[PDB]
Curated annotation (Swiss-Prot), chain A:
Gene source species: Mus musculus
N-terminal signal peptide: none
One GO MF term: NADH dehydrogenase (ubiquinone) activity
One GO term describing the cellular component: mitochondrion
Protein name stated in the entry: NADH-ubiquinone oxidoreductase chain 4L
Function: Core subunit of the mitochondrial membrane respiratory chain NADH dehydrogenase (Complex I) which catalyzes electron transfer from NADH through the respiratory chain, using ubiquinone as an electron acceptor. Part of the enzyme membrane arm which is embedded in the lipid bilayer and involved in proton translocation.
Gene encoding the protein: Mtnd4l
Complex and partners: Core subunit of respiratory chain NADH dehydrogenase (Complex I) which is composed of 45 different subunits.
Known catalytic reactions: a ubiquinone + NADH + 5 H(+)(in) = a ubiquinol + NAD(+) + 4 H(+)(out)
From Swiss-Prot, chain E:
Organism taxonomic ancestry: Eukaryota, Metazoa, Chordata, Craniata, Vertebrata
Function: Core subunit of the mitochondrial membrane respiratory chain NADH dehydrogenase (Complex I) which catalyzes electron transfer from NADH through the respiratory chain, using ubiquinone as an electron acceptor. Essential for the catalytic activity of complex I.
InterPro entries linked to this entry: NADH_UbQ/plastoQ_OxRdtase_su3, NDAH_ubi_oxred_su3_sf
Protein name according to UniProt: NADH-ubiquinone oxidoreductase chain 3
Primary residence: mitochondrion
Organism of provenance: Mus musculus (Mouse)
A Gene Ontology BP annotation from the UniProt entry: cellular response to glucocorticoid stimulus
UniProtKB/Swiss-Prot annotation, chain H:
Lineage, opening ranks: Eukaryota, Metazoa, Chordata, Craniata, Vertebrata
Purpose of the protein: Accessory subunit of the mitochondrial membrane respiratory chain NADH dehydrogenase (Complex I), that is believed not to be involved in catalysis. Complex I functions in the transfer of electrons from NADH to the respiratory chain. The immediate electron acceptor for the enzyme is believed to be ubiquinone.
The encoding gene: Ndufs5
Domains as described in the record: Contains two C-X9-C motifs that are predicted to form a helix-coil-helix structure, permitting the formation of intramolecular disulfide bonds.
Chain segments carrying region Disordered: 78-105
Motif (Cx9C motif 2): 55-65
Family, as annotated: Belongs to the complex I NDUFS5 subunit family.
Compositional bias of kind Basic and acidic residues: 78-90
One GO biological process term: mitochondrial respiratory chain complex I assembly
Intracellular or extracellular location(s): Mitochondrion inner membrane; Mitochondrion intermembrane space
UniProt signal peptide: none
Name the UniProt record assigns to this protein: NADH dehydrogenase [ubiquinone] iron-sulfur protein 5
Species this chain originates from: Mus musculus (Mouse)
UniProtKB/Swiss-Prot annotation, chain J:
Localization, UniProt: Mitochondrion inner membrane
Example of a GO biological process term: positive regulation of mitochondrial membrane potential
Gene Ontology cellular-component terms listed: mitochondrial inner membrane; mitochondrion; respiratory chain complex I
Pfam families in UniProt: NDUF_C2
Matching PANTHER family: NADH DEHYDROGENASE [UBIQUINONE] 1 SUBUNIT C2-RELATED (PTHR13099:SF0), NADH-UBIQUINONE OXIDOREDUCTASE SUBUNIT B14.5B (PTHR13099)
Protein name listed in UniProt: NADH dehydrogenase [ubiquinone] 1 subunit C2
Known role: Accessory subunit of the mitochondrial membrane respiratory chain NADH dehydrogenase (Complex I), that is believed not to be involved in catalysis but required for the complex assembly. Complex I functions in the transfer of electrons from NADH to the respiratory chain. The immediate electron acceptor for the enzyme is believed to be ubiquinone.
Chief location category: mitochondrion
Membrane spanning residue stretches: 57-76
Domain of life where this protein originates: Eukaryota
């Protein structure tokens, strides 16, 4: 358990780091968010299985559901920005500077 | 460790000059590096060598202000017989402000920074004597 | 803090069944009927004490009852029982539905020779009474004394003194 | 094993409470062999 | 250990067939043979350019419906409950809400491909 | 938007925060946060203009990152204490990360660069929701964990945001960005007083909401969105100038107006707790707010700016837009100090 | 609406079937003698151990032996 | 919770799965059920500030049960000494710990 | 087998590292597929089953839709792989070596703590109900139909509102 | 601070315990100021909608003033209850812990050597 939790926390940390520093494509940022979602779900799953707490196993599934809903919203926003600018580049998202 | 920074107040001023100067220089350098990281993360520069030059300039300027402040404060407290008199921190802060003005090539910054930094340092010293507490914990 | 108190290897010794899972399944129902008081006393011991170190003497009585039961079967209904549990062992999950005929043979043999009666579908699973002189373990959790609550201010409400004492508002 | 280590209480519990705490597989099979430990860990998951 | 063994055996079999297929045949590599294929004429443009997806809305809706599938997949164990009435009511509400969402999308032309 | 979408979306925006403040479980508070996040975005992108899409994307990315950080905090607290609520024994880093991520959600500095842009992009009638209704949930999450927060971190964020909002307000000409910066400053006060006495944090939240909503409806009245544009109210709608002036001054926080009560009471509590330096600095820097509100007052009410020929037809045409709630909130926000004792 | 229902029956039979089956899925459980027995059966299934309860001498219904007449009886399940 | 709608209305939407000691499916209690129950019953009534000092023993037992840091320390030390003694040559693994035992039923 | 779980977690870390470095979305999806598989395996090894399989299923679907979106919008004339960009390649190797060295450092400073490479695999499972029957994670998850109906209500509402939100965002 | 007070009953406007306090006098300055606020709000609404400021909407003005007074009465009652509860808990706690709030004995002025600073 301890080593697994350490590596999983490091994985979430790396995915958060990847989200915080961009790299042009918004789709990649969405994927990094989705990876953090994966890591958090795994954390919860292993914690519950370790503790034999079967009343908290309803909660990782809720995590997945809500993360899926937000990911769908993100994809729709990607579609709209693409319709606006021709690409998904985050550079174009600079109008509101003024 | 925070022991290094808390060692600044191990012995009253006018003594262990070199050590106190080192400590203030390090603190100024840290502040400068933080500010430089912010100023590069926002408002990027054309060249990466430009960015590193910027971080160097900010860091060295802040370190210089801190070093001059510590040196002048300790020298004042030592040459005059008053160890814990806030006028010493005021003179040190004014020295820091003047050094900032020189580094920026401007007399107006020299004057404004002298007044403001000297007042800040004097208020710091006053707080340390009188027991003021910044960032307190809920007492109600 | 304190040295744990594990029982000695000598007192953890008892004659043991050494009969396979298929055999135990084949003998289960009648073994649930006969040998009920002993098992139930031991089970109540487990649940009440919560300490496995405090029910060993009763667990060994459980083992002795099991040995007696199986010795009786071996003495009287041995061959039908061997047939029955061979057929059970063959099955993948040891399902009863596959060997009913041999089950009938064994059940009749025990019913006539030894007077046993098999339990119906709803018998072995009902909660039962148990009689024991073993006293009810008090403080089973070794619980510390609960900290005393805060004192409760007792009185009757009255209007605030000199109104809402806020800076300058008269009331 | 711990005959001569300076300060060791042989049967010391890690719990204040004197209640029986079930032993977890690490304690139970720790000194045994890797085979027994891995059996305890995976015998059911890794199928029959 | 059996599942790992059999899956690794499958992997090794497939990879071995590939390696044999790549190291047995006699080869002749040249530019015209290697260049991409497009009905006998050269590519007017590379295939990496944007390719509009005319079913984007249905594609996203698939995500949410699959998560609904996830929410429903515990039913075989759920039915082994004591609160059968509660389980029934909850499952009925869930499926009816699924149906209403699909019906609204249909009536709003979500499923009609975008031109 | 068709009626059924309006019903469902507005109902979900209303639901999210209610779940957050009526949930005993951290995962359910997180569920409320996600509800608000998901449901607001379609309202933001309702216009479907290039600026609107970009504002919605900025909001989405920032809020999603904040929610994930909070969820990490929840999961680690679970790993530690086998429960779904923060306890006194909970590791300090977990609470630090929670405060940090809820700060990002709230828009507090130095995580404040996102709020001005989104507010500028989005229309006023949704700017109101963004700067009022969407703060109740995160601040509730903090208030439920107030005894365990970190005084150093909270005071640092609060003072940072006071300074940053005050400085940012000056430069901006756009009303939408000005209201964003005002939001930042007032939230700075709210969090400054949170760890010591959350009742006053809630008082400040109430008064800020009750002052911002009137101002946002005032802007909506003529769709004003610039200093120059709002300068034409002396011609388009003279009546409102008096209350607009009073309300801007109150938000600034002059004594006779209500806006004083939050700042004065918060300074009083901080002084009781011996937070003299931070209290002094915050009070001092809260005057740039009065400056960049006084500029607006000068532009609108005290001086008459040049008007256009075509405003004459605006005069000719009739108007039926100001609500009863405008008058109620405006008066009850800018004329209530004498009832201050009852408020606290 | 006879006309619209009759047309739907032929031009969109799939939806007619779906709505009818959904309606039945709701209606039938309320209208059926056997519905009560599902929860009783799932309560009859004994997954965990039946914990004996100490006899304080004044427990008159719970039996002392499994084969005693007292206690729940699965005759109803046996001949459901 | 910030507003006690649930306590006010008498409903329990989410207050029944807060800790490991709550009711579990088919009466399968979670790890450290007894420890958590002790801690919570100790800490009821008295405020959180007083509990943080007057139920500390129970909390320490609970965290030990749930995380087991001290147990890992102890096992690590025992096996470290076993390895050191073995490399020296002053210990042998007994038959039952080695691989051949008299397996018990 | 001793190093089974630690190896799986390290592979998860590496997949997440690649995703963080953010190659083209196609390689991002491939990396996340591998990471989802490894995470499902970790959950399976920790006694889970339904949860691991569900994550794998939902993630396969999600990456399918994501790939479809990438081919249409998130595309470039020359997509960049992990190795194409020298900085990405160098930092990939740097991250791998850095994690190795960090593992060593934590092991050295805390011989027993966050990581116990010595004694690794000795604490994977803590407790198991040896003679139980109903202990499968599917039961706990299905509890949403009985004891946690609030969870079901909120999640179902989330999906329902998602339908309308998505339609009106894409209008 | 008062949320955890023993006997707290969640989300109750006026707990039954509040009936033992003298109820607000209905010509209180606070309620009168509430009525004044309501009247001014009505006038403001008239002015904004471009109406006869004082002549028009008398039903509206009456509703405003009466609503303000009606809300003010009950809110004032709750506030009185809360301040009374605070004082009750105050004095109960102080009585319980005489050790931590000892009563000071004050020396008269004769025996106190207050320094004298000339104002020359
Ligand atoms: C103080 C801040 C002052 C900001 C400057 C405001 C300003 O310049 O006014 C607009 C001014 C332009 O005036 P205008 O072009 O002649 O026409 C505007 C009139 O509203 C033209 O409209 P009208 O003639 O149809 O209506 C006139 C209206 C008179 O209404 C007004 O226009 C004056 C309203 C401001 C009165 C300020 C009271 C000061 C309180 C002292 C404490 O009614 C009356 O004549 C008498 C009614 C009694 C006075 C109304 C008071 C109701 C609200 C009270 C709220 C108090 C808040 C504090 O510029
Ligand atoms: C219109 C008049 C309507 C007819 C009168 C109402 C019917 C009636 O006969 O009842 C009389 C009613 C009840 O009298 P009573 O309690 O039986 O006799 C004892 C006195 O009331 C003794 O009074 P009290 O000591 O029991 O109550 C005092 C209470 C009094 O509370 C109040 O009602 C204050 C009223 C403020 C005027 O709180 C205060 O101490 C006043 C402090 C408030 C803060 C003042 C300074 C802050 C700066 C000013 C800002 C003003 C607001 C913003 C203005 C606009 C800016 C744009 O009293 C009044 O109607 C007038 C109250 C006068 C209070 C002092 C005013 C200064
Ligand atoms: C005469 C003066 C009149 C003043 C006129 C207007 C003044 C204009 C200034 C506008 C701001 C005023 C509000 C200031 C304020 O909110 O104080 C902070 C105040 C401090 O609250 P707290 O002591 O920290 O804890 C309150 C608990 O959340 C919850 O505490 P609780 O569970 O003990 O009960 C809360 C209480 C709350 O009652 C209220 O209606 C409070 C509403 C205050 C807003 C203004 C009215 O009861 C209710 O929730 C309503 C009961 C409905 C069902 C009864 C059957 O914030 C609130 O109470 C609002 C929280 C929402 C509760 C609903
Ligand atoms: C169960 C059915 C599925 C089975 C799939 C596996 C297929 C197994 C087929 C068995 C036959 C193995 C011999 C295949 C040779 C095919 C390639 C070939 O002909 O190369 C000739 C080559 C020709 O020799 P060469 O190189 O001197 O020919 C002239 C070369 N150029 C044109 C460049 C001048 O000979 C080999 O070296 C092949 C060695 C095969 C061993
Ligand atoms: C610490 C540094 C981590 C790697 C830095 C990569 C280069 C960089 O400039 O950081 C920001 C980077 C975006 O870089 P880019 O827009 O592609 O322009 C490069 C200009 N030389 O942003 C990124 O590429 C994301 C970097 C994520 C790194 C995750 C792994 C770090 C392991 C250590
Ligand atoms: C807890 C520990 C507290 C440590 C406090 C350290 C304070 C460091 C000083 C504040 C940093 C300000 C960054 C800066 O220098 O401004 C850069 C940029 C202006 O652009 P530029 O012209 O390039 O730089 C000129 C700088 N004189 O302007 C900016 O980048 C805007 C920066 C806004 C956010 C500053 C946040 C400072 C406080 C962070 C607390 C956490």
């Amino acid at each position: 358990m301890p080593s697994t939790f350490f590596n999983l926390t490091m994985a979430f940390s790396l995915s958060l780091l990847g989200t915080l520093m961009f790299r042009s494509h918004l789709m990649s940022t969405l994927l990094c968010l989705e990876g953090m979602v994966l890591s958090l779900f795994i954390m919860t799953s292993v914690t519950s299985l370790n503790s034999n707490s079967m009343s908290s196993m309803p909660i990782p599934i809720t995590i997945l559901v809500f993360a899926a809903c937000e990911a769908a919203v993100g994809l729709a926003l990607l579609v709209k920005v693409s319709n606006t600018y021709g690409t998904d580049y985050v550079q174009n998202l600079n109008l509101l500077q003024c | 460790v925070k022991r290094f920074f808390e060692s600044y107040h191990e012995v009253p001023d006018g003594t262990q000059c070199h050590r106190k100067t080192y400590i203030t220089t390090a603190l100024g350098g840290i502040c400068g590096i933080i500010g430089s990281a912010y100023s590069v993360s926002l408002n990027p520069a054309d060249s990466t060598l430009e960015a590193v030059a910027r971080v160097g300039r900010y860091t060295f300027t802040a370190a210089a202000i801190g070093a001059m402040f510590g040196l002048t404060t300790c020298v004042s407290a030592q040459v005059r017989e008053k160890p814990d008199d806030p006028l010493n921190y005021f003179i040190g802060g004014c020295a820091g402000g003047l050094t900032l003005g020189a580094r920026t090539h401007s007399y107006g910054t020299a004057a404004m920074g002298c007044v403001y930094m000297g007042t800040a340092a004097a208020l710091f010293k006053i707080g340390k004597l009188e027991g003021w507490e910044l960032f307190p914990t809920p007492k109600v | 803090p304190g040295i744990v108190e594990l029982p000695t290897l000598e007192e953890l010794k008892v004659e043991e069944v050494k009969v396979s899972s298929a055999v135990l399944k084949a003998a289960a129902h009648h073994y649930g009927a006969q040998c009920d008081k002993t098992n139930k006393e031991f089970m109540l011991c487990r649940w009440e004490e919560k300490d496995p170190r405090r029910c060993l003497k009763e667990g060994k009585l459980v083992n002795g009852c099991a040995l007696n039961f199986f010795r009786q079967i071996k003495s009287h209904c041995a061959e039908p029982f061997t047939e029955y549990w061979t057929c059970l062992d063959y099955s993948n999950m040891q399902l009863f539905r596959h060997c009913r005929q041999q089950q009938a043979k064994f059940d009749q043999c025990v019913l006539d020779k030894l007077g046993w009666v098999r339990p119906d579908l709803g018998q072995l699973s009902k909660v039962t009474k148990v009689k024991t002189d073993r006293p009810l373990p008090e403080n089973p959790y070794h619980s510390r004394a609960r900290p005393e609550p805060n004192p409760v201010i007792e009185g009757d409400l009255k209007p605030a003194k000199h109104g809402t004492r806020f800076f300058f508002w008269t009331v | 094993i711990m005959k001569d280590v300076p300060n060791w209480k042989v049967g010391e519990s890690v719990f204040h409470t004197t209640r029986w705490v079930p032993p977890l597989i690490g304690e139970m099979y720790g000194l045994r062999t890797k085979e027994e430990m891995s059996n305890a860990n995976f015998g059911f998951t890794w199928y029959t | 250990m059996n599942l790992y063994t059999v899956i690794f055996i499958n992997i090794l079999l497939s990879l071995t067939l590939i390696l044999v297929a790549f190291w047995l045949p006699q080869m002749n590599l040249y530019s015209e043979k290697a260049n991409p294929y497009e009905c006998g004429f050269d590519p007017t443009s590379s295939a990496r350019l944007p390719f509009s997806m005319k079913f984007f809305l249905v594609a996203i809706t698939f995500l949410l419906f699959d998560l609904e599938i996830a929410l429903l997949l515990p039913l075989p164990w759920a039915i082994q409950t004591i609160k059968t009435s509660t389980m029934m009511i909850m499952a009925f509400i869930l499926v009816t809400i699924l149906s209403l969402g699909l019906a609204y999308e249909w009536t709003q032309k979500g499923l009609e491909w975008t031109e | 938007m068709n009626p059924i979408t309006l019903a469902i979306i507005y109902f979900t925006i209303f639901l999210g925060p209610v779940i957050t403040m009526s949930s005993t479980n951290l995962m359910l508070m997180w569920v409320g946060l996600e509800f608000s996040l998901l449901a607001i975005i379609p309202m933001l992108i309702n216009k479907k203009n290039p600026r609107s899409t970009e504002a919605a994307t900025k909001y989405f990315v920032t809020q999603a990152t904040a929610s994930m950080i909070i969820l990490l905090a929840i999961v680690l607290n679970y790993k530690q204490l086998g429960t779904w609520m923060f306890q006194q024994q909970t590791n300090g880093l977990i609470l630090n990360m929670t405060l940090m991520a809820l700060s990002m959600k709230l828009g507090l500095a130095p995580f404040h660069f996102w709020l001005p842009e989104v507010t500028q992009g989005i229309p006023l009638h949704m700017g109101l929701i963004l700067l009022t209704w969407q703060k109740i949930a995160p601040l509730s999450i903090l208030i439920q964990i107030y005894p365990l927060l970190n005084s150093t971190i909270i005071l640092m964020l609060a003072i940072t945001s006071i300074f940053m909002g005050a400085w940012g307000g000056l430069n901006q000409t756009q009303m939408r960005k000005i209201m964003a910066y005002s939001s930042i400053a007032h939230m700075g006060w709210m969090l400054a007083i949170l760890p010591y006495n959350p009742s006053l944090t809630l008082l400040n939240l109430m008064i800020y909401i009750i002052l911002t909503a009137p101002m946002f409806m005032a802007l909506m009245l003529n769709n004003s969105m610039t200093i120059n544009s709002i300068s034409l109210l002396w011609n388009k709608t003279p009546a409102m100038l008096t209350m607009i002036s009073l309300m801007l001054l109150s938000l600034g926080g002059l004594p006779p107006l209500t806006g004083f009560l939050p700042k004065w009471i918060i300074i009083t509590e901080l002084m009781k707790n011996n937070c003299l330096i931070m209290a002094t600095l915050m009070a001092m820097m809260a005057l740039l707010n009065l400056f960049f509100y006084t500029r607006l007052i000068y532009s609108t009410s005290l001086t008459m700016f040049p008007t256009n020929n075509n405003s004459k037809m605006m005069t000719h045409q009739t108007k039926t837009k100001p609500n009863l709630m405008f008058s109620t909130l405006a008066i009850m926000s800018t004329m209530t100090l004498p009832l201050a004792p009852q408020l606290i | 609406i006879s006309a619209f229902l009759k047309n739907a029956w032929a031009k969109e039979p799939v939806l007619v079937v779906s709505f009818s089956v959904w309606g039945l899925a709701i209606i039938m459980p309320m209208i059926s003698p056997y519905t009560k027995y599902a929860s009783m059966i799932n309560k009859a299934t004994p997954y965990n151990y039946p914990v004996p309860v100490r006899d304080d001498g004044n427990m008159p219904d719970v039996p002392s032996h499994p084969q005693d007449p007292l206690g729940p009886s699965l005759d109803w399940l046996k001949n459901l | 919770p910030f507003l006690d709608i649930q306590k006010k209305l008498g409903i329990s939407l989410d207050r029944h799965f807060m800790f490991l000691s709550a009711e579990q499916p088919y009466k399968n209690a979670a790890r450290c059920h007894a420890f958590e129950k002790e801690w919570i019953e100790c800490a009821h009534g008295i405020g959180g500030t007083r509990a943080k000092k007057e139920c500390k023993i129970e909390f320490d037992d609970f965290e030990e049960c749930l995380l087991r840091y001290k147990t890992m320390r102890r096992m690590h030390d025992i096996k470290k000494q076993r390895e050191k003694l073995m490399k020296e040559g002053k210990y042998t693994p007994p038959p039952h710990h080695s691989g051949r035992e008299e397996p018990r039923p | 087998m001793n190093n089974y779980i630690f190896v799986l977690s390290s592979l998860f870390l590496v997949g997440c590292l690649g995703l963080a470095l953010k190659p083209s979305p196609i390689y991002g999806g491939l990396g996340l597929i591998v990471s989802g598989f490894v995470g499902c395996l970790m959950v399976l090894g920790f006694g889970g089953s339904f949860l691991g399989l569900m994550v794998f299923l939902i993630y396969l679907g999600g990456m399918l839709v994501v790939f479809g979106y990438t081919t249409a919008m998130a595309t470039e004339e020359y997509p960049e792989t992990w190795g194409s960009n020298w900085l990405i390649l160098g930092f990939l190797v740097l991250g791998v070596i850095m994690e190795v060295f960090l593992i060593c450092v934590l092991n050295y400073y805390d011989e027993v703590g966050v990581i116990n490479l010595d004694g690794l695999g000795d604490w994977l499972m803590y407790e198991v109900d040896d003679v139980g029957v109903m202990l499968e994670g599917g039961i706990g998850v299905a509890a949403m139909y009985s004891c946690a109906t609030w969870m079901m209500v909120v999640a179902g509402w989330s999906l329902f509102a998602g339908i309308f939100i998505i339609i009106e965002i894409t209008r | 601070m008062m949320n955890g007070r023993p006997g707290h009953e969640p989300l109750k406007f006026l707990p039954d315990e509040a009936r033992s306090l003298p109820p607000p006098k209905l010509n209180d300055p606070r309620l009168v100021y509430m009525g004044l606020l309501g009247y001014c709000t009505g006038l403001m609404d008239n002015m904004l909608r471009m109406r006869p400021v004082m002549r028009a909407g008398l039903h509206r003005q009456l509703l405003f003033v009466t609503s303000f007074v009606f809300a003010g009465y009950f809110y004032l009652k709750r506030q009185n209850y809360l301040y009374a509860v605070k004082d009750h808990d105050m004095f109960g706690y102080i009585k319980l812990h005489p050790e931590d709030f000892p009563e000071k004995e004050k020396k008269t002025y004769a025996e106190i050597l207050e320094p004298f600073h000339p104002v020359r």
